[PDB]
Amino acid sequence: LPVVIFTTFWGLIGIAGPWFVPKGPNRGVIITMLVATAVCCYLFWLIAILAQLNPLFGPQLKNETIWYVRFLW
Amino acid sequence: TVPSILNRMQTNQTPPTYNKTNKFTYGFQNIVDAYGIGTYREINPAPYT
Amino acid sequence: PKLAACGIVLSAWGVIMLIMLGIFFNVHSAVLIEDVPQNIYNLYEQVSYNCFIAASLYLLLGGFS
């Protein structure tokens, strides 16, 4: 499962993100840039892998695309 | 040789607002201020923007 | 001046975009099955032969500009 893998690989930035930051005058902005990139991008992935988890439909395929990827997958 | 001196006042006039700004975070700063410039010591949305 | 300047950035995109179209048709990709009227793989490479000779034709427009 990548859900228990990507919860810490996007959890490195945002938890170990503010732990290693230089002491310059851009500390309050780069930490805000690193944390909000970890919040927005990971939740964007989170609400996309949950939509396909436990589905309800199936891909309605064209007739030439019924027998084609049997040789390809 | 006479010095210029700097006296601090204590009025109730509304102070202007100022933002520390690089070359990077300038475009995101004046895209917030195009609608309305914030009050004195308001929470600035531009780092989150 | 500008018609000479707009042609190089179109050709520089014309060599990048059409080469990757040539490699994506050489690998016989499953997403591109709308453009095909082991035998079907040879039609895919034919379009990759088609793309590449137009990707190289944009290099001539770069030297002309």
From Swiss-Prot, chain A:
Topological domain spans for side Lumenal: 50-73
Record GO cellular component, one term: synaptic vesicle membrane
Residue ranges crossing the lipid bilayer per the database entry: 1-21, 29-49
Predominant location category: membrane
Keyword Ion transport belongs to the record: yes
List of glycosylated residues: N63
One Pfam family this sequence matches: ATP_synt_H
Tissue specificity field: Expressed in brain (at protein level).
A Gene Ontology molecular function term of the record: proton-transporting ATPase activity, rotational mechanism
Family: Belongs to the V-ATPase e1/e2 subunit family.
Job description of the protein: Subunit of the V0 complex of vacuolar(H+)-ATPase (V-ATPase), a multisubunit enzyme composed of a peripheral complex (V1) that hydrolyzes ATP and a membrane integral complex (V0) that translocates protons. V-ATPase is responsible for acidifying and maintaining the pH of intracellular compartments and in some cell types, is targeted to the plasma membrane, where it is responsible for acidifying the extracellular environment.
Stated name of the protein: V-type proton ATPase subunit e 2
Lineage per the UniProt record: Eukaryota, Metazoa, Chordata, Craniata, Vertebrata
Swiss-Prot record, chain C:
Biological processes, Gene Ontology terms: endosomal lumen acidification; pH reduction; proton transmembrane transport; receptor-mediated endocytosis; receptor-mediated endocytosis of virus by host cell
Protein's gene: RNASEK
One GO molecular-function entry: RNA endonuclease activity
Topological type in the membrane: Multi-pass membrane protein
Higher taxonomy: Eukaryota, Metazoa, Chordata, Craniata, Vertebrata
Family: Belongs to the RNase K family.
Cellular component annotations (GO), alphabetically ordered: clathrin-coated vesicle membrane; endomembrane system; vacuolar proton-transporting V-type ATPase, V0 domain
Known EC number: 3.1.-.-
UniProt-recorded name of the protein: Ribonuclease kappa
Keywords: Cytoplasmic vesicle, Endocytosis, Endonuclease, Hydrogen ion transport, Hydrolase, Ion transport, Membrane, Nuclease, Transmembrane, Transmembrane helix, Transport
Oligomeric form and interacting partners: Interacts with the proton translocation complex V0 of the V-ATPase. Interacts with ATP6AP1.
